[PDB]
Curated annotation (Swiss-Prot):
<feature type="site" description="Transition state stabilizer">
    <location>
        <position position="45"/>
    </location>
</feature>
<dbReference type="GO" id="GO:0042744">
    <property type="term" value="P:hydrogen peroxide catabolic process"/>
</dbReference>
<dbReference type="GO" id="GO:0034599">
    <property type="term" value="P:cellular response to oxidative stress"/>
</dbReference>
<dbReference type="GO" id="GO:0004130">
    <property type="term" value="F:cytochrome-c peroxidase activity"/>
</dbReference>
<keyword id="KW-0496">Mitochondrion</keyword>
<dbReference type="GO" id="GO:0005759">
    <property type="term" value="C:mitochondrial matrix"/>
</dbReference>
<keyword id="KW-0809">Transit peptide</keyword>
<feature type="active site" description="Proton acceptor">
    <location>
        <position position="49"/>
    </location>
</feature>
<dbReference type="GO" id="GO:0020037">
    <property type="term" value="F:heme binding"/>
</dbReference>
<feature type="binding site" description="axial binding residue">
    <location>
        <position position="172"/>
    </location>
    <ligand>
        <name>heme b</name>
    </ligand>
</feature>
<dbReference type="GO" id="GO:0000302">
    <property type="term" value="P:response to reactive oxygen species"/>
</dbReference>
<keyword id="KW-0597">Phosphoprotein</keyword>
<keyword id="KW-0349">Heme</keyword>
<dbReference type="GO" id="GO:0004601">
    <property type="term" value="F:peroxidase activity"/>
</dbReference>
<comment type="similarity">
    <text>Belongs to the peroxidase family. Cytochrome c peroxidase subfamily.</text>
</comment>
<keyword id="KW-0556">Organic radical</keyword>
<comment type="function">
    <text>Destroys radicals which are normally produced within the cells and which are toxic to biological systems.</text>
</comment>
């Protein structure tokens, strides 16, 4: 099963920078969402969830086809809450109807990371919408109530190794769990809408207690008022993950570089880029543009 990237007709870097900017300006404008966390974190989660359906074995799922727009995937229990990110992006799609759905969802995540002061994430265009019957079944996204061996095995399906897994998980410094969406409640950190390596520092430095939340699920809670999922905490229970947690806790630049690589890879899994495709784009932030 082959998905060849096809550049939206006649478009180039400037066109996609305009879409970036519109997303970034709306992120700035719609500041109140989720008790003033804003839409950055949910856009990052949306980009991951539309990518994380991928299966390396048969190239089903993945970001290419933009299939989140169809009811089966939209209504996946694993995707509860992401409707907010979709609704956010709706007016952007209306303004730029030429961009594919998978390009828009993935670019939303890139824009959020960068506007939250994260690393630059190179991004490639050319995902093409595919029909409703290409939508992957529910159940391809990961469970939170599991251990390190689960996490490691899960991510093999997305062709991610230990370092890539631990780097990607650093996104859990962003935003929060919401009891109504996932059966977990609380923020992972103090800087909910700024991208840093706080996830790793908090895992190592906080005093975590294994408690039950109001949905009768176990989660790790700190006296500082933070939480970790069982799968997050597994990164300090497994010796191989722990070494990499310590590395990123002690080197902000290394985390940023490794995250950027793993996140681009996640967003591009399943896609074949022609040898004469454009190079990946690196978008300027609003701040860099004086906007
Ligand atoms: C073992 C893997 C993972 C599990 C089990 C998992 C699970 C969860 C759960 C249960 C939530 C809360 C959803 C809600 O209640 O609103 C969540 C939030 C989120 N996840 Fe993950 N996740 C995993 C990996 C990732 C990865 C790879 C990324 C992206 C690089 C990511 C990004 C986020 C973001 C940013 C949030 C916050 C969303 C918000 O504030 O609205 N997750 N995740």
């Amino acid at each position: 099963l082959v998905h060849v990237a096809s550049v939206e007709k006649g478009r180039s870097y400037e066109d996609f920078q305009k879409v970036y900017n519109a997303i970034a300006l709306k992120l700035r404008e719609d500041d109140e969402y989720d008790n003033y966390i804003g839409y950055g974190p949910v856009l990052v989660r949306l980009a991951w969830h539309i990518s994380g359906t991928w299966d390396k074995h048969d190239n089903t799922g993945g970001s290419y086809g933009g299939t989140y727009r169809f009811k089966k995937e939209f209504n996946d229990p694993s995707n509860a809450g992401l409707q907010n990110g979709f609704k956010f992006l709706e007016p952007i799609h209306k303004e730029f109807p030429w961009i594919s759905s998978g390009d828009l969802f993935s670019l939303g995540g890139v824009t959020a990371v960068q506007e939250m002061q994260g690393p630059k994430i190179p991004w490639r265009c050319g995902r093409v919408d595919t029909p409703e019957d290409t939508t992957p079944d529910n159940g391809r996204l990961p469970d939170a109530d599991k251990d390190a061996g689960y996490v490691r095995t899960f991510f093999q399906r997305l062709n991610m190794n230990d370092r890539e897994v631990v780097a990607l998980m650093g996104a859990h410094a962003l935003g929060k769990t919401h009891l109504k969406n996932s059966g977990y409640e609380g923020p992972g950190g103090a800087a909910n809408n700024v991208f840093t390596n706080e996830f790793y520092l908090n895992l190592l430095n906080e005093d975590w207690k294994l408690e039950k939340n109001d949905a009768n699920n176990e989660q790790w809670d700190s006296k500082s008022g933070y939480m970790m999922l069982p799968t997050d905490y597994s990164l300090i229970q497994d010796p191989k993950y722990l070494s990499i947690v310590k590395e990123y806790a002690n080197d902000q630049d290394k985390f940023f570089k490794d995250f950027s690589k793993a996140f681009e890879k996640l967003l591009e899994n399943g896609i074949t880029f022609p040898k004469d495709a454009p190079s990946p784009f690196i978008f300027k932030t609003l701040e860099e543009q004086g906007l």
